[PDB]
Design a binder for this molecule. Structure first.
Ligand SMILES: Cc1n[nH]c2ccc(-c3cncc(OC[C@@H](N)Cc4c[nH]c5ccccc45)c3)cc12
Lengths: 336, 20
């Protein structure tokens, strides 16, 4: 495991220092449907014509990225995802840019997002939540060993694949940092108290966010909610959490140790690091090798309909991919 | 119930990342 991590780091470092660039072109793909949107732009199902492989293609508008002050963060996202390789995230298969846009092409996860399944079902059993949680613990172990902080854990970002496993998606705030960092970013419900309080923070925010996720998966709502973000932040910084009565003892105990304001006590952050989590009692029934190797049966598999089936996603207005005759923001994105 | 308070709240749909 120390050894697995060492080799993964050597592989990651080579790509990190010598990033792949301009590895496809838009005309090599057929666009089939928009799967999702946000401030970043759009994610589309596309088919690579040469192979007939389907992929998710994220399309960013350079001028919008500039207006949003996300140049460096977008550069981070692309440089990271082209360099990683892990079962529960989607590295870049291809990337490129044109006059107007930035493109990132990744493995397509057909099952939809956890968020939609979670809301519809209400909540997940502790076993069901533990299956997903384990995939997160392993991805964070991997990411943090590479000096990467993720900074946006939430159900909306966890895409379900055909086997019922998870892909962590949207690395718009991921950063390679060896010390502390200061950017106010993330999603209100999932922000650690250090972020809200404008302290310099580290990877421990990712472990706090796991606490929020496990809670939300098991309860059906988040530990800290309200109608407006400022109400949510007061609740986070006070820090008092109430657990549903259906929560097991072991679940509450882990959550007390993840949702811990005291950084000297927050699990994931201590001298034993990720093993405080992996060896906590709530995970006692978890075989971490079988999870990595995807040999455990998923508590929920979405129905096979086709490798390009989009029915586990919403419908969105389908707008064009307009490519200017003039190159926008050349210097800003020169390394992309 | 807490469940009823959540479902009646304005934040049961997909939540966006923050902007400053
Ligand atoms: C669906 C899918 N298969 N593979 C990938 C890789 C990467 C993404 C992805 C990339 N960039 C941002 C993303 O946003 C996740 C959420 N922040 C927004 C969102 C909510 N529902 C969907 C559905 C489809 C894409 C994005 C979103 C995801 C999606 C997929």
């Amino acid at each position: 495991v120390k050894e697995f991590l060492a080799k993964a780091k050597e592989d990651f470092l080579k790509k990190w220092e010598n990033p792949a660039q301009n590895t496809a072109h838009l005309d090599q793909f057929e666009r089939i449907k928009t799967l999702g949107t946000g401030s970043f732009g759009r994610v589309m199902l596309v088919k690579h014509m040469e192979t007939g492989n389907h992929y998710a293609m994220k399309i960013l508008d350079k001028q919008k990225v500039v207006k949003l002050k996300q140049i460096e963060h977008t550069l981070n996202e692309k440089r990271i995802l082209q360099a990683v390789n892990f079962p529960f995230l989607t590295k870049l298969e291809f990337s490129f840019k044109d006059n107007s846009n930035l493109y990132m092409v990744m493995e397509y996860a057909p099952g939809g997002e956890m968020f939609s399944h979670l809301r519809r079902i209400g909540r997940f059993s502790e076993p069901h939540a533990r299956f997903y949680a384990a995939q997160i613990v392993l991805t964070f172990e991997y990411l943090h060993s590479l000096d990467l902080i993720y900074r946006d854990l939430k159900p909306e970002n966890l895409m379900i694949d055909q086997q019922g496993y998870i892909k962590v998606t949207d690395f718009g705030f991921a950063k390679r940092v060896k010390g502390r960092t200061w950017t106010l970013c993330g999603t209100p419900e999932y922000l650690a108290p250090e972020i809200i309080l404008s302290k310099g923070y580290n990877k421990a925010v990712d472990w706090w966010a796991l606490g929020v996720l496990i809670y939300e998966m098991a309860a059906g709502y988040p530990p800290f909610f309200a109608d407006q973000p400022i109400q949510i932040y007061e609740k986070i910084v006070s820090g008092k959490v109430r657990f549903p009565s259906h929560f097991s003892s072991d679940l509450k105990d882990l959550l007390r140790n993840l949702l811990q304001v005291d950084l000297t006590k927050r699990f994931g952050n201590l001298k034993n690091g990720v093993n405080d989590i992996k060896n906590h009692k709530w995970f006692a029934t978890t075989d971490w090798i079988a999870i990595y190797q995807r040999k455990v049966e998923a508590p929920f598999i979405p129905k096979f309909k086709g490798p390009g089936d989009t029915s586990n996603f919403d419908d969105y207005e389908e707008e064009e991919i307009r490519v200017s005759i003039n190159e926008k923001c050349g210097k800003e994105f020169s390394e992309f | 119930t807490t469940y009823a308070d959540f479902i009646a709240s304005g934040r049961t749909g997909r939540r966006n990342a923050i902007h400053d």
